[PDB]
Amino acid sequence: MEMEKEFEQIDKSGSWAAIYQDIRHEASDFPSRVAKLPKNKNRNRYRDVSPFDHSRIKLHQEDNDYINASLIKMEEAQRSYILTQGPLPNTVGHFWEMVWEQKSRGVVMLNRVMEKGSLKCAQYWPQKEEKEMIFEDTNLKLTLISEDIKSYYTVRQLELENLTTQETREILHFHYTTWPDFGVPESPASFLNFLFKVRESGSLSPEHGPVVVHCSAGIGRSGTFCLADTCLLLMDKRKDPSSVDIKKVLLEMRKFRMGLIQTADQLRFSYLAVIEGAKFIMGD
Ligand SMILES: O=C1NC[C@H]2CCN(C(=O)c3ccccc3)CC[C@H]12
User: Fold this and answer.
1) How many whole angstroms separate alpha carbon 27 and alpha carbon 253?
2) CB 267 within 8 A of CB 19
3) Greatest Cα-to-Cα distance within the chain, rounded to the nearest angstrom
4) Which residues, renumbered to this chain, carry the PTM Cysteine sulfenic acid (-SOH)?
5) Which residue has a Cα nearest atom 10 of ligand 1?
6) Residue 82 is part of which domain span?
7) Cα distance between residue 81 and residue 248, in whole Å
8) How many helices (DSSP H) and strands (DSSP E) are in the chain?
């Protein structure tokens, strides 16, 4: 069923809450035993948001390999994503270790450091060229190279150095700065413009490790970004773009990380983004 008609039918009936609860009921439940070990309590931002054991990213160290991060592998779309929480004061070194080890070219940030008057993630990148950051626990150095500030997002060029080998890499930081403190954006136009900027950079392409995507918990805004990207890629690849079922793609992605899309309003916004984005994909 053409999702644009499915959309008007749900809107006219006001059943968004009912559709959303159906997804919550059918979603996968896999063990997260490593996340719940007592040694890992200060590595989790939220007690109710944990990576499944089968899909968690492992750090390459013998001490403790744990980070709150999941590999989402989309087989038909041929895209992979790492979804993670906003870094904590004691996990900023782990965060950059993961980016290094997974060979990522792009970090996508969908939150502000402070929202609703509270801290939603650590200040984990340098704000001035001449004041670099050193992560002594993981042996990494991070330098700000350049910053491009736009009305709805900022792009930063960063240099990550493995101090152990003196190898250096250029990491692109894509920061969406205008998601409102409450609710979802009224129009998906600026979110789709942002998605297209990340794509145009190479950060989502198979020649690089998976993009790292985060918000505060790494399930709500982060879920909206990967769901919209994968649905638009499937509409490009298939003979019948009308066969793409956003609810079935979301349930496939929930096999790899719990809780993706946190509200009925985030679910409606995801439909709007895919419907408006398709009017490019189909030749405009
Ligand atoms: O695998 C990688 N992950 C982070 C990357 C760090 C910096 N690199 C580049 O900016 C680059 C140059 C030419 C062609 C394509 C990419 C090289 C590839 C590295």
Assistant:
1) 9
2) yes
3) 60
4) 215
5) 170
6) 1-283
7) 18
8) 7, 10
Please pick, among 121, 215, 226, 231, the residue that the annotation labels catalytic. 215
DSSP 220: S
Number of domains present in the structure of the chain: 1
Confirm whether residue 223 is marked as ligand binding: no
The DSSP annotation for 184-199 comes to --S-SHHHHHHHHHHH
How far apart (Å, rounded) are the C-alpha atoms in residues 1 and 274? Answer: 14
Q: Give the single-character DSSP code of 119.
A: E
Question: Does 215 qualify as catalytic in the annotation?
Answer: yes
CA distance 28 to 96: 29
- Say which experimental method was used: X-ray
Q: Which atom of ligand 1 is nearest to the CA of 208?
A: 1
CA–CA distance, 229 with 107 (Å, rounded to integer): 15
Q: Where does the chain break, by residue before each gap (C–N > 2.5 Å)?
A: none
Q: What is the resolution of this structure in A?
A: 1.7
The residues, ordered by sequence, that sit 6+ positions from 264 with a Cβ below 8 Å of its Cβ are 16, 17, 19, 20
